[PDB]
Amino acid sequence: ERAGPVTWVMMIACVVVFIAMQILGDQEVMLWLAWPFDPTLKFEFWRYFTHALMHFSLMHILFNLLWWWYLGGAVEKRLGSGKLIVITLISALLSGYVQQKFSGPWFGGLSGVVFALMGYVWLRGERDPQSGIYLQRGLIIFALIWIVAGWFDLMSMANGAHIAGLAVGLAMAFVDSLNA
Numbered sequence: 751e752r753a754g755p756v757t758w759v760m761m762i763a764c765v766v767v768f769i770a771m772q773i774l775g776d777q778e779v780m781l782w783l784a785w786p787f788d789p790t791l792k793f794e795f796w797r798y799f800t801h802a803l804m805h806f807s808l809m810h811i812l813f814n815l816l817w818w819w820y821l822g823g824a825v826e827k828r829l830g831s832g833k834l835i836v837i838t839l840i841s842a843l844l845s846g847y848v849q850q851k852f853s854g855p856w857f858g859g860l861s862g863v864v865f866a867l868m869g870y871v872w873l874r875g876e877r878d879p880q881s882g883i884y885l886q887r888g889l890i891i892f893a894l895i896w897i898v899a900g901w902f903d904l905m906s907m908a909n910g911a912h913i914a915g916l917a918v919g920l921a922m923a924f925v926d927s928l929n930a
Contacts (some may be wrong), residue, residue: 753819754826756834761815764860767803768811776806780856785846787855802842804858814860821867821885828882841866841918845911852910862911868893869919877927 753761771779783800786792805811826834845862868885872893875884885893897916900907 752827753823754831754834756831756838757819757823757826760818760822760838760860764803764805764811764815764818767800768805771804771806776804779804780858784858785850785855798846799839799842801846801858802838802860802863805860806858810859814864817864818860818867821864821871824871824883825867837866837870837919837922838863840922841915844918845908845915848914849908849911853908857908857911859908859911861908862915865893865897865912865915866919866922869916870923871919873920873923874927877923878930881926 767779767783783804784797785801786794786797791797805814822834822838825837841863845866846857849857849862868889871883872885872890874881897909897912899905900909900912
């Protein structure tokens with residue numbers, strides 16, 4: 751069944767970029783897709799989003815894609831493709847902006863988008879149950895353990911990206927839930 755088209759196009763794009771990273775090397779791809787490290791690069795607009803496509807091991811990509819396929823598939827199934835796209839664009843842009851302030855431009859991965867979708871599905875399912883999405887208590891647990899694990903580096907997480915992504919998804923869900 752579904753996954754919808756935006757869930758799968760994102761999965762294929764991450765897989766494609768990851769294969770390219772295996773062949774060319776991480777750093778070679780990073781030089782072109784990472785958030786700009788130099789203000790002269792600031793009009794290379796793809797870079798504000800393409801950092802989300804990069805993963806640094808199979809575990810990195812599998813674990814993000816799992817959560818993406820589960821949470822993104824639910825948003826796209828119940829609320830449609832345009833909604834998933836907007837959540838993704840805004841959370842990638844804002845979690846990358848915050849991550850870059852916390853630790854500079856050398857980061858990547860979908861987990862900023864993942865924490866926005868965790869925030870969104872949980873708050874939306876809580877305040878607006880008729881949306882048909884929700885986040886189970888078990889998963890809420892793991893999310894909270896995952897954030898704090900990053901605080902203590904149990905590893906080297908994009909901690910700014912996590913909290914900012916989370917905030918973004920909570921705020922969009924709050925706004926979407928007011929509305930009906």
